[PDB]
Amino acid sequence: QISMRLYSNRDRPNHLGPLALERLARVDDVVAQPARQPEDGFAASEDSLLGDVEEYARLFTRFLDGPVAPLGDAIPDDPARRAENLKASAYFLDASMVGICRLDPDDRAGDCDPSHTHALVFAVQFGREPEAGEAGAEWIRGTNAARTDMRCAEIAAILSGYVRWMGFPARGHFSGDAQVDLARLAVRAGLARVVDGVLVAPFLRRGFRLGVVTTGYALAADRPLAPEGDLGETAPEVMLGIDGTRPGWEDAEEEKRPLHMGRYPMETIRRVDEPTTLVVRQEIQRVAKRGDFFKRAEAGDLGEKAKQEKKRFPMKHPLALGMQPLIQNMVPLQGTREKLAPTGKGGDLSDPGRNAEAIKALGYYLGADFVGICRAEPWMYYASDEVEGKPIEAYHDYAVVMLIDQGYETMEGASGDDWISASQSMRAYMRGAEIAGVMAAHCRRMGYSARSHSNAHSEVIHNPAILMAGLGEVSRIGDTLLNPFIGPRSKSIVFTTDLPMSVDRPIDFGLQDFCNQCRKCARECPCNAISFGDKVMFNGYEIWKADVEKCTKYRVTQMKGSACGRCMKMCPWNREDTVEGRRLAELSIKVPEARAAIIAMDDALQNGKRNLIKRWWFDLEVIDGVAGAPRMGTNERDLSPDRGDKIGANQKLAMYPPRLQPPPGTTLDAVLPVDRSGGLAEYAAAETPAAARARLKSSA
Ligand code: B12
Ligand SMILES: O=C(O)c1ccc(O)c(Br)c1
Ligand code: SF4
Ligand code: SF4
Ligand code: NA
């Protein structure tokens, strides 16, 4: 695979994006002319996704405008900084291309707010579609504009809400609900030119759709593209992406892989029938959802401060607040548990192997980074819900598991526990829930029960589904599985369904031996919650059990950031998507003799250091509905020194298997103070995986 960037973007600020837009011919003004956005080249049937992406577009539309917070005294004045931060925000949310332009009278003369002076214009590129005759082509053909419009409305809604929380009135616009001329503003903002009355954007050869945020929050404006002639898209500096931008050949190369195979070469990873760590199904107890340690925090199980902060701790930052409406209001759409009657829509559904390819292709078309399929085994479902305490049924046969990359470049400039951490969680959560909600809907359209499991509402535990779907291995981080290509830098989304699909197999890329020689995540955890010792048996399976009490307490309670994810950032597998980055992963997998060296040089080269160029976000904590400067400061952590050579023997963590959890049926209205002394003793008594294998063998 030769599409990886040759050159690093480590010195490229995020407001510049992944495309070398700063190398295109531009001029101060251009004469406006009629233009429409690109459209599909075919129509969509009743077999098609179309109805579902339109529903979610309509849902996001109700968050294009909303309440405006009081103006604090911490919002930077400089329009240039405002421009970069908002541009970077849009790229964070996966805009393909971003620009800014000034609104003039003719725009404010419509239903648009008359106090609006500037427009943030962004484009999202059409998704890749299955080739004719491929599995799922009928589900997708003709849905690209609506599909891309949904994504635009999403981003517009988040960004508009983001500015509104900084105290500035703002309004999102897209084809489905726009008060301004979208095409006209895209040309003025320098994203596109006009060919035969249709917009044409450089680099976005697949087509695109637009979104816009109009606001009185003043921004530095960009300049339109040179109206005629070659823009320089194929100049040598741009073709090779010398500044760390998308190579000029990557599109043509990527488009040679079948869409259902995803972008990362998972087909090259070794497969095994059973996971690389022991799983003893007959010994795995199901856990009350009330045993979720956030649910425990919420009920008072972890003290009053954890209970107080449980609601706000991930919403301290205005960007995450812009995502909350979408997150919470997608929940009522997650799907059904009852059996459905196959409706005859969706084409030929008799080949489970073709069904899996269509589902994977469908996920990648919608924005997933990884798709895997496994059976939703009953021990993967929670025993009981946390609100009413009623039993949860194992109501679906299959689990579709998708990984959303949390974002390398943002995490590179962060501490892992500063004011953007929860925003990296919530973005991946918001994006996965959207994609999974759309896919479950389509399954239900075809007459196959399906329900998604999101951050706001899940009835399965994602982890074992990530394992069985072959998307990660057990890693030292504990409650996080590690993928060979994006390491631990992910949020998973799962949706269960009865749609017959061929399942994937667990993967084996050598991580057990690698984590056995590595301690970086454990060394860098601010509250020492990650284990330095051997794997233990836990509720019937082998795992590195982190101390989930200490982690929960720190994420909900620490006041120099919003939550934490520092362990993802520090892991050596958290790497840039470069030629040398992939090769370091390749070597880690194929050359065991080189692992110790890679683990050491990761420190010697100061990997994990904060890259100040990538720190694009504002430090804003919302207190009493008003964004202000962080009341207590901001985490700015740097590489830490070794703990003892004896820390694996001395560190003592608490574990909470079902025995030390709220029993099935317990609700949030009961309180069960965390029995830490019992969790410490429990951990000391945990069977070692070696003893479990001996014990199982004696009944084989
Ligand atoms: C609440 C919660 C936490 C809590 C508490 C978890 C807990 N154990 O109580 C803390 C602990 C606060 C937490 C921490 C983080 N977690 Co969290 N956690 C959750 C959440 C929402 C609940 C887990 C749960 O069901 N209850 C707790 C009970 C079931 O815990 P348990 O009995 O000890 O079992 C745990 C593990 O043993 C594992 N597991 C259970 N059965 C089996 C069986 C096998 C064979 C294996 C291998 C594993 C496994 O799953 C449980 C995860 O907590 C899930 C989301 C979800 N719906 O699953 C994620 C989730 C697992 N965590 C996730 C992440 C990303 C994080 C963080 C990195 C935060 C961040 N910035 O992203 C940190 C890392 C923590 C670490 N050191 O590993 C991701 C992991 C994805 C992945 N790639 O593996 C999840 C899946 C959310 C998601 N949608 O992606 N979060
Ligand atoms: O319930 C919450 O507040 C919550 C749930 C999931 C999650 O990843 C985070 Br961060 C917070
Ligand atoms: S284990 Fe928890 S507290 Fe420690 S670095 Fe990871 S997210 Fe932060
Ligand atoms: S930091 Fe090292 S030990 Fe921790 S998960 Fe990553 S590779 Fe494994
Ligand atoms: Na790293």
Tab-separated table of N, CA and C in Angstrom, residues 260-315:
chain	number	residue	atom	x	y	z
A	260	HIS	N	-15.789	-2.029	0.434
A	260	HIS	CA	-16.092	-2.806	1.626
A	260	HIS	C	-14.847	-3.224	2.392
A	261	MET	N	-13.657	-2.987	1.850
A	261	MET	CA	-12.434	-3.359	2.546
A	261	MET	C	-11.892	-2.257	3.448
A	262	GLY	N	-12.478	-1.065	3.417
A	262	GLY	CA	-12.020	0.018	4.259
A	262	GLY	C	-10.708	0.578	3.749
A	263	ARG	N	-10.232	1.602	4.446
A	263	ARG	CA	-9.030	2.296	4.013
A	263	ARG	C	-7.763	1.661	4.558
A	264	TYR	N	-7.823	1.092	5.757
A	264	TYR	CA	-6.656	0.449	6.344
A	264	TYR	C	-6.611	-1.030	5.964
A	265	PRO	N	-5.438	-1.565	5.644
A	265	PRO	CA	-5.355	-2.945	5.119
A	265	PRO	C	-5.519	-4.009	6.199
A	266	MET	N	-6.731	-4.100	6.755
A	266	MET	CA	-7.011	-5.128	7.750
A	266	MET	C	-6.892	-6.535	7.177
A	267	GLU	N	-7.033	-6.693	5.858
A	267	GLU	CA	-6.921	-8.018	5.261
A	267	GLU	C	-5.517	-8.588	5.402
A	268	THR	N	-4.531	-7.753	5.713
A	268	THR	CA	-3.167	-8.206	5.927
A	268	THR	C	-2.901	-8.651	7.359
A	269	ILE	N	-3.841	-8.431	8.275
A	269	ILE	CA	-3.639	-8.773	9.677
A	269	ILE	C	-4.004	-10.235	9.887
A	270	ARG	N	-3.185	-10.934	10.670
A	270	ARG	CA	-3.398	-12.352	10.923
A	270	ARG	C	-4.698	-12.597	11.687
A	271	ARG	N	-5.469	-13.581	11.232
A	271	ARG	CA	-6.734	-13.947	11.852
A	271	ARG	C	-6.606	-15.260	12.614
A	272	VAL	N	-7.361	-15.377	13.700
A	272	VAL	CA	-7.393	-16.598	14.494
A	272	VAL	C	-8.826	-16.853	14.937
A	273	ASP	N	-9.155	-18.133	15.130
A	273	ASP	CA	-10.525	-18.498	15.470
A	273	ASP	C	-10.900	-18.040	16.870
A	274	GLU	N	-9.938	-17.998	17.787
A	274	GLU	CA	-10.171	-17.524	19.138
A	274	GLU	C	-9.265	-16.338	19.437
A	275	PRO	N	-9.681	-15.435	20.324
A	275	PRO	CA	-8.861	-14.255	20.613
A	275	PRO	C	-7.502	-14.636	21.175
A	276	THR	N	-6.585	-13.671	21.134
A	276	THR	CA	-5.238	-13.905	21.637
A	276	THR	C	-5.178	-13.938	23.155
A	277	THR	N	-6.293	-13.679	23.827
A	277	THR	CA	-6.388	-13.738	25.274
A	277	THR	C	-7.555	-14.640	25.645
A	278	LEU	N	-7.459	-15.268	26.814
A	278	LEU	CA	-8.392	-16.329	27.168
A	278	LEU	C	-9.794	-15.780	27.411
A	279	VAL	N	-10.795	-16.462	26.854
A	279	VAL	CA	-12.202	-16.129	27.066
A	279	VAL	C	-12.943	-17.405	27.458
A	280	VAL	N	-13.476	-17.434	28.681
A	280	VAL	CA	-14.170	-18.606	29.207
A	280	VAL	C	-15.656	-18.299	29.327
A	281	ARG	N	-16.393	-18.480	28.227
A	281	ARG	CA	-17.770	-17.996	28.147
A	281	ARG	C	-18.642	-18.512	29.284
A	282	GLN	N	-18.511	-19.791	29.636
A	282	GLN	CA	-19.361	-20.334	30.690
A	282	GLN	C	-19.077	-19.727	32.060
A	283	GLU	N	-18.030	-18.913	32.192
A	283	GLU	CA	-17.700	-18.265	33.452
A	283	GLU	C	-17.906	-16.762	33.418
A	284	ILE	N	-18.415	-16.214	32.320
A	284	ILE	CA	-18.628	-14.776	32.197
A	284	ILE	C	-20.034	-14.453	32.692
A	285	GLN	N	-20.121	-13.716	33.792
A	285	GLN	CA	-21.408	-13.239	34.267
A	285	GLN	C	-21.802	-11.944	33.569
A	286	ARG	N	-23.104	-11.766	33.390
A	286	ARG	CA	-23.620	-10.514	32.867
A	286	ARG	C	-23.727	-9.483	33.987
A	287	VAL	N	-23.491	-8.222	33.634
A	287	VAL	CA	-23.369	-7.138	34.603
A	287	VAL	C	-24.575	-6.215	34.497
A	288	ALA	N	-25.104	-5.809	35.648
A	288	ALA	CA	-26.115	-4.765	35.661
A	288	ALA	C	-25.557	-3.519	34.988
A	289	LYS	N	-26.358	-2.888	34.120
A	289	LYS	CA	-25.923	-1.620	33.541
A	289	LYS	C	-25.606	-0.611	34.630
A	290	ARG	N	-26.297	-0.709	35.761
A	290	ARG	CA	-26.021	0.102	36.938
A	290	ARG	C	-24.599	-0.089	37.444
A	291	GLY	N	-23.878	-1.082	36.928
A	291	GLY	CA	-22.513	-1.342	37.352
A	291	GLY	C	-21.496	-0.538	36.567
A	292	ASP	N	-21.921	-0.025	35.416
A	292	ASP	CA	-21.189	1.019	34.717
A	292	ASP	C	-20.747	2.075	35.721
A	293	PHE	N	-19.442	2.348	35.765
A	293	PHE	CA	-18.935	3.194	36.842
A	293	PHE	C	-19.304	4.661	36.682
A	294	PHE	N	-19.681	5.104	35.481
A	294	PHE	CA	-20.346	6.399	35.374
A	294	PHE	C	-21.716	6.354	36.037
A	295	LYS	N	-22.480	5.284	35.793
A	295	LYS	CA	-23.745	5.107	36.498
A	295	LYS	C	-23.526	5.029	38.004
A	296	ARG	N	-22.457	4.356	38.440
A	296	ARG	CA	-22.154	4.320	39.867
A	296	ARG	C	-21.857	5.718	40.391
A	297	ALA	N	-21.019	6.468	39.671
A	297	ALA	CA	-20.753	7.851	40.047
A	297	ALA	C	-22.049	8.639	40.167
A	298	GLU	N	-22.944	8.478	39.187
A	298	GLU	CA	-24.176	9.258	39.163
A	298	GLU	C	-25.065	8.961	40.365
A	299	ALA	N	-25.058	7.723	40.850
A	299	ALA	CA	-25.928	7.316	41.944
A	299	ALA	C	-25.358	7.633	43.320
A	300	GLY	N	-24.131	8.148	43.397
A	300	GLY	CA	-23.490	8.431	44.665
A	300	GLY	C	-22.489	7.390	45.120
A	301	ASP	N	-22.303	6.315	44.352
A	301	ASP	CA	-21.418	5.226	44.752
A	301	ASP	C	-19.976	5.669	44.974
A	302	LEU	N	-19.552	6.783	44.377
A	302	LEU	CA	-18.163	7.214	44.448
A	302	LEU	C	-17.983	8.496	45.253
A	303	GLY	N	-18.968	8.875	46.054
A	303	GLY	CA	-18.879	10.098	46.824
A	303	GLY	C	-19.694	11.209	46.200
A	304	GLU	N	-19.726	12.341	46.908
A	304	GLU	CA	-20.612	13.422	46.499
A	304	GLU	C	-20.017	14.248	45.369
A	305	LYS	N	-18.698	14.446	45.368
A	305	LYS	CA	-18.103	15.270	44.323
A	305	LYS	C	-18.220	14.597	42.961
A	306	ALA	N	-17.953	13.290	42.898
A	306	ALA	CA	-18.167	12.552	41.657
A	306	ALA	C	-19.628	12.619	41.224
A	307	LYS	N	-20.550	12.526	42.185
A	307	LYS	CA	-21.970	12.635	41.872
A	307	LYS	C	-22.316	14.025	41.350
A	308	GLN	N	-21.769	15.069	41.980
A	308	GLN	CA	-22.056	16.439	41.557
A	308	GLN	C	-21.595	16.688	40.126
A	309	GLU	N	-20.381	16.254	39.796
A	309	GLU	CA	-19.770	16.584	38.517
A	309	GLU	C	-20.107	15.596	37.410
A	310	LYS	N	-20.820	14.512	37.723
A	310	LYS	CA	-21.066	13.479	36.725
A	310	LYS	C	-21.754	14.033	35.487
A	311	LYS	N	-22.608	15.047	35.648
A	311	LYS	CA	-23.378	15.533	34.507
A	311	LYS	C	-22.574	16.497	33.639
A	312	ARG	N	-21.767	17.370	34.252
A	312	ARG	CA	-21.105	18.440	33.515
A	312	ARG	C	-19.687	18.110	33.072
A	313	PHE	N	-19.049	17.095	33.653
A	313	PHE	CA	-17.611	16.941	33.459
A	313	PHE	C	-17.190	16.824	31.995
A	314	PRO	N	-17.976	16.249	31.084
A	314	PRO	CA	-17.582	16.228	29.671
A	314	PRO	C	-18.134	17.384	28.849
A	315	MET	N	-18.881	18.298	29.471
A	315	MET	CA	-19.507	19.422	28.785
A	315	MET	C	-18.989	20.755	29.311
